[PDB]
Design a protein around this ligand. Structure first.
Ligand SMILES: N#Cc1ccc(COC[C@H]2O[C@@H](n3c(NCc4ccc(Cl)c(Cl)c4)nc4c(N)ncnc43)[C@H](O)[C@@H]2O)cc1
Length: 377
């Protein structure tokens, strides 16, 4: 048995190719993704949903976004910039960063591959729990733009987990293989992979000829995703509250939370029907917030951000010296591409051209890694 693991920034996912069909193994909690979270608490260490869920109670010893630190040096523009926004401690141990935590009363320090080895250990377990066998061999994916150092730090992060990493594979190639774009014959095809998750955005252009892949260019926005979209809604509703009820709820962390949470959920609903209702009882100072939102209004709150996504598309076409009519295939991954106006912009931008999207976008990377781990098996 060999697995494909999509090791992501916010979530990880693990799959196995069995009985001629891929299976996205579910966790001990029944979820097909597992947050890449690791908490340290007085008595135990927590990974996945257990860690995600006590992040309010222990925000200072609950680590996440370790993919943003992996393989980088302490002075990397990105280690520096992100550090400002993490409750936990990032520490310069001799030019290489470390996360230091409180864990059983003793303060311990951790390299990022140590912290990614824990997510990988858990994913290994998730599979071994499902398959009722030992799992060792894996494919683990990384973004196309990762360098040697960051590939090595990931590969090690697995070798530490007890994994036999058969291969490290680019996420947009994982998704290409998922869609069997690598079994098309004859002439070289150019493939654009649009990855829009919750917090990060990545465009990747690859050429594929005869099932041999090559990375042509990299683009993206490293702080754009579904979360910017929920914020647009939170502002629309906070204004709407102030209107009808002349109150400002925004300095009440809990009212805003109840609202955020209802906004992300409403957002998901708007990808499949044309409006979405919200009732939040006694939201602020005793007042009920009963409201509703159409898709068209949601689209308008985000109209600039939805378009803004086409720039990494252009900028990546630039750097790959390709005209948009030369793109043979478009592949959508990351759970935000489920938003229809986003698919509509992209289809219309690429002059009516179809989109490859039938595989679950959250899962497609892990799908292709598992398909591929099977061949290398
Ligand atoms: N269980 C679970 C689970 C699985 C994957 C993810 C990751 O999602 C990353 C981003 O993708 C966004 N998103 C997602 N994410 C997938 C998802 C599916 C179910 C649940 Cl309960 C959750 Cl909450 C998230 N679906 C969207 C949709 N249908 N329309 C618009 N946006 C969608 C989501 O809001 C988030 O911002 C998050 C949760």
């Amino acid at each position: 048995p060999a697995v494909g693991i999509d090791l992501g920034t916010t979530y990880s996912c693990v799959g196995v190719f069995q009985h001629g069909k891929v299976e996205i193994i579910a966790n001990d909690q029944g979820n097909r993704t597992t947050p890449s979270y690791v908490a340290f608490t007085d008595t135990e260490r927590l990974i996945g949903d257990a860690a995600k869920n006590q992040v309010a109670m222990n925000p200072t010893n609950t680590v996440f976004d370790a993919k943003r630190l992996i393989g980088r040096r302490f002075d990397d523009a990105v280690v520096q910039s992100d550090m400002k926004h993490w409750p936990f401690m990032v520490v310069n141990d001799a030019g290489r960063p470390k996360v230091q935590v409180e864990y059983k009363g003793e303060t311990k320090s951790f390299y990022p591959e140590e912290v990614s080895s824990m997510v990988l250990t858990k994913m290994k377990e998730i599979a071994e729990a499902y398959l009722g066998k030992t799992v060792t061999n894996a494919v683990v994916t990384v973004p196309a733009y990762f360098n040697d150092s960051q590939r090595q730090a990931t590969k090690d992060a697995g070798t530490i987990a007890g994994l036999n990493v058969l291969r490290i594979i680019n996420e947009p190639t994982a998704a290409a293989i998922a869609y069997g774009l690598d079994k098309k014959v004859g002439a070289e095809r150019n493939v654009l992979i649009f990855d829009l998750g919750g917090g990060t955005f990545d465009v990747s252009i690859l050429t594929i000829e005869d099932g041999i892949f090559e990375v042509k260019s990299t683009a993206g926005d490293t702080h754009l995703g579904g979360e910017d979209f929920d914020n647009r809604m939170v502002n629309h509703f906070i204004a709407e509250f102030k209107r009808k009820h002349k109150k400002d709820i925004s300095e009440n962390k809990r009212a805003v939370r109840r609202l955020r949470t209802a906004c992300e959920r409403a957002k998901r609903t708007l990808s499949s029907s044309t409006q979405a209702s919200i009732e939040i009882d006694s939201l602020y100072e005793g007042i009920d917030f009963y409201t509703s939102i159409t898709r068209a209004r949601f689209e308008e709150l985000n109209a600039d951000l939805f378009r803004g996504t086409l720039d990494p598309v252009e900028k990546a076409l630039r750097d790959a010296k390709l005209d948009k009519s030369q793109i043979h295939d478009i592949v959508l991954v990351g759970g935000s591409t489920r938003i229809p106006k986003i698919q509509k912009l992209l289809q219309d931008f690429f002059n009516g051209k179809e989109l490859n999207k039938s595989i679950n976008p959250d899962e497609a990377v892990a799908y292709g890694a598992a398909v591929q781990a099977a061949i290398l098996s």
